[PDB]
Amino acid sequence: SFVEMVDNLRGKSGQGYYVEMTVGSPPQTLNILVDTGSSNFAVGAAPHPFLHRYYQRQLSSTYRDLRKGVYVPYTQGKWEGELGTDLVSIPHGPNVTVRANIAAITESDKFFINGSNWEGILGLAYAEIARPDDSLEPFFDSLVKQTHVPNLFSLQLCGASVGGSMIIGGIDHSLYTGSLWYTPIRREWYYEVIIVRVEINGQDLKMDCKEYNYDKSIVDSGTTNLRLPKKVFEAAVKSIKAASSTEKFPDGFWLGEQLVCWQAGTTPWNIFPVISLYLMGEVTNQSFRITILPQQYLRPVESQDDCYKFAISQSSTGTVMGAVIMEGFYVVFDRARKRIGFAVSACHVHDEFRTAAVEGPFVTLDMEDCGYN
């Protein structure tokens, strides 16, 4: 039942959202980072200074060795380990046990985060980007094949402790307001989408829309930031700077290298622009927009100052709609209908004159054009 899954995510501010899972017989409990940017399920399986527990394959009677090594690189770090299968279940998830591929992590480099409270990663994207190749069936594909869990999940990430929900197999309408707006999944590898327009405080960034999606645009729960191609990042930083040029920010602030601080309760939110991303819609010449507030992209780093990191950053690998974007929203990963839905979440943060929004319909032409090939 869906209420069972409401509030099944936890985390620490800026350290990742995780769901509880059990691997093996008898069940070993682990906290697993929810990652829509990858397709491998992997767990700490050897001692590590940042780990408080790990998978113990020797203690599981249902463990099978696949007798294959694996390496998974990401933007932020990488791990290697050994491939196996085992029985997996999600306590605040559907009432099922599946046999799934699990990579036992045996070494890693800048992967685990000290104090984050998670010991593994659930990659929820498609087999096309699984390591070492697309025949290593991802967890969610195993789940759907082996149970009657519908081929859909949703993510409500509640930011600024963190919490939220991963609704497995469905949409929980008590968790958002207004209507869901859907964008096509362009290709089933990452959750790839097409951005057709960008506005900052209502002013069109006016770039060729190909720039927004060079060389892809994805929805990624495992990445903190809004990550933007170089040209777009520069255009956007230039606008955000102009809008806030009432105030003094070291150039390292704009690079996420340094924090800005304000006497508690005096953050000048009004001087930071809203950002609207327009997404390709479901119908011919249809688009919709999602609007994010400064509070999403100025992330509080916890002295009686309020201090913040700038959480829009540059990318050489396309646009990444990270938790910065997703925190405003209820996000439906509707794999069965090849689409991603956005609605404003019931847990949206509160500006007192401005609102995170999902609005449509808009008309926009040759959204063809925006796709990078």
Ligand SMILES: COCCO[C@H](C[C@H](O)[C@H](COc1cc(F)cc(F)c1)NC(=O)c1cc(C(=O)N[C@H](C)c2ccccc2)cc(N(C)S(C)(=O)=O)c1)C(=O)N[C@H](C(=O)NCc1ccccc1)C(C)C
């Ligand atoms: C490249 O296009 C974008 C796709 O990016 C995904 C990122 C993926 O979501 C991984 C998943 O989670 C990890 C978390 C970690 F702590 C350490 C990790 F190593 C991974 N995430 C990140 O790489 C990542 C994580 C974080 C990060 O801090 N995550 C924490 C857990 C967090 C905090 C709050 C909210 C949500 C998450 C930050 C960043 N940034 C760069 S940043 C500063 O925000 O701009 C990136 C990814 O890298 N996927 C892999 C990939 O594409 N690899 C190819 C590759 C090879 C070599 C180099 C780079 C890429 C594969 C396996 C599908």
